[PDB]
Design a protein around this ligand. Structure first.
Ligand code: HEM
Length: 148
């Protein structure tokens, strides 16, 4: 697929520095939707502000987790059923911690935001469409996790 190659190529530089990039993605996410901030709780405490999340080892480690799973999706772009069971299991864990399917779109926009800002003129229309379809396939796999 030419499309799988657009994804792989655009992901290369991001994957070289996954935390700095996931940091953009989550900074965006909490700028768009600060009501997601209390979902991330460690030691029991609640992050008061988005910048508080960026000081938390548990939260930074969470970011690297997320970026590893997107990397996995990229690795498997050509099939992506090879990941479906993992992703459905990921979906279940989300439903169990109280996330709602409606939040998926804001995360997708945060991802696409981070990619546009990283790539600039290399984030071609074709690249964006490819990413939107990949993210949508990942979401559709995870959504199963809300099946029961
Ligand atoms: C619907 C929008 C989403 C919200 C609101 C959300 C929120 C969360 C929260 C609150 C946690 C648990 C945090 C913790 O206790 O440390 C989590 C875990 C995680 N998220 Fe998301 N998430 C969303 C979508 C996604 C997407 C699209 C992916 C990537 C495919 C993803 C990847 C992960 C991973 C890998 C974990 C760790 C799961 C584990 O520990 O087993 N999430 N997410």
């Amino acid at each position: 697929r030419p499309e799988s190659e657009l994804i792989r190529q655009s992901w290369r530089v991001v994957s070289r520095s996954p935390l700095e990039h996931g940091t953009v993605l989550f900074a965006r996410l909490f700028a768009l939707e600060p009501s997601l901030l209390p979902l991330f709780q460690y030691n029991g405490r609640q992050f008061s502000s988005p910048e508080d999340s960026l000081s938390s080892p548990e939260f930074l480690d969470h970011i690297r987790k997320v970026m590893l799973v997107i990397d996995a999706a990229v690795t498997n772009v050509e099939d992506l059923s090879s990941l479906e069971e993992y992703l459905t299991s990921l979906g279940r864990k989300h439903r169990a911690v109280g996330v709602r399917l409606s939040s998926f779109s804001t995360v997708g926009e945060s991802l696409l935001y981070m990619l546009e800002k990283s790539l600039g003129p290399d984030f071609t229309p074709a690249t964006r469409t490819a990413w939107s379809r990949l993210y949508g396939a990942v979401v559709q796999a995870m959504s199963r996790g809300w099946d029961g």
